[PDB]
Amino acid sequence: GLTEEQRMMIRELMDAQMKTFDTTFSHFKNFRLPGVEAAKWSQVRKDLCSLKVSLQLRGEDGSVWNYKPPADSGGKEIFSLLPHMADMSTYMFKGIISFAKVISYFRDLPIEDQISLLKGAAFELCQLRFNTVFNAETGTWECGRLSYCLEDFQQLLLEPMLKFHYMLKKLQLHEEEYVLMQAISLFSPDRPGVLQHRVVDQLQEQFAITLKSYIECNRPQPAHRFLFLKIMAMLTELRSINAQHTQRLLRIQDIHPFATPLMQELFGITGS
Numbered sequence: 543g544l545t546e547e548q549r550m551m552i553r554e555l556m557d558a559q560m561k562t563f564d565t566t567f568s569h570f571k572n573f574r575l576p577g578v579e580a581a582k583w584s585q586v587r588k589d590l591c592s593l594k595v596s597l598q599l600r601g602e603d604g605s606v607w608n609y610k611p612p613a614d615s616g617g618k619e620i621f622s623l624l625p626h627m628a629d630m631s632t633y634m635f636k637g638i639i640s641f642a643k644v645i646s647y648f649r650d651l652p653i654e655d656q657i658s659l660l661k662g663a664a665f666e667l668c669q670l671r672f673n674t675v676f677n678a679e680t681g682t683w684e685c686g687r688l689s690y691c692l693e694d695f696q697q698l699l700l701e702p703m704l705k706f707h708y709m710l711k712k713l714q715l716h717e718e719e720y721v722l723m724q725a726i727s728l729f730s731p732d733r734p735g736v737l738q739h740r741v742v743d744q745l746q747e748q749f750a751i752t753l754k755s756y757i758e759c760n761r762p763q764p765a766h767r768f769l770f771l772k773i774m775a776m777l778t779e780l781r782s783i784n785a786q787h788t789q790r791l792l793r794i795q796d797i798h799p800f801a802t803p804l805m806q807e808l809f810g811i812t813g814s
């Protein structure tokens with residue numbers, strides 16, 4: 543029940559996803575691993591312990607390395623996973639940038655708006671891709687040979703990022719619905735610095751109409767009533783999480799620098 547333009551739109555998004563999402567993380571390599579003002583620190587300590595994961599690395603030979611993080615003992619040990627997480631997020635950001643550049647509607651925007659949209663949406667598209675490898679039964683992001691497992695229930699769901707991942711996963715979305723969510727987030731007309739507000743706003747409305755129509759054509763079941771509105775509400779929540787997490791990053795960076803060059807670009811840090 544989709545128009546020709548709508549089916550072409552979904553095809554181009556699925557094509558871009560297929561070419562730029564390394565779903566087995568086969569090409570994520572050479573990453574760092576953990577080794578073998580007072581009111582600012584209190585806040586940064588609160589920021590960093592809201593996400594506690596162990597790390598597992600499965601070797602191509604069948605060997606397994608497992609890392610269990612330290613407890614907070616009021617010292618620098620809270621930063622032990624930051625270099626690794628910077629490398630993983632940088633890796634994800636490159637895939638996201640490649641995704642945008644493959645899409646015709648994005649290529650056709652002026653380069654300054656391309657940049658402003660990527661700065662605005664890179665984190666959100668990263669989270670959307672990570673949700674597709676999240677295992678909600680085991681609390682683990684399964685990234686090929688790497689796994690990130692939440693450390694020991696309804697308590698962890700208090701953290702908005704974690705509640706987001708569990709709630710989005712339980713909607714049991716199709717690949718097409720995920721990539722349309724990525725498009726709607728990418729083409730957000732109200733990101734800081736956007737000039738072609740009207741063009742971006744019209745593109746976003748078309749991706750949202752395509753998603754609403756896709757759901758109406760392919761999901762008649764009572765469990766999926768209001769699915770389109772649930773997704774849109776999740777995208778609003780993701781924007782709030784984006785703003786919250788950007789402020790945590792800048793606080794951590796202020797007292798303990800760790801952002802990679804690509805992270806600095808996307809998040810406004812100039813090097814001075």
Ligand SMILES: C[C@]12CC[C@@H]3c4ccc(O)cc4CC[C@H]3[C@@H]1CC[C@@H]2O
Pocket residue numbers: 589590591592593624627628631632665787788790791805
């Ligand atoms: C997720 C946190 C805020 C967002 C931070 C971030 C945000 C963006 C990014 O590219 C990398 C990282 C690594 C550290 C993350 C933090 C670790 C704990 C904190 O909640």
Ligand SMILES: ClC1=C(Cl)[C@]2(Cl)[C@@H]3C[C@@H](Cl)[C@@H](Cl)[C@@H]3[C@@]1(Cl)C2(Cl)Cl
Pocket residue numbers: 593595626627628630631634668669672683690703
């Ligand atoms: Cl998404 C995101 C990724 Cl990707 C990183 Cl590198 C990390 C990897 C897995 Cl554990 C997800 Cl939950 C986290 C965060 Cl919030 C961070 Cl910590 Cl940004």
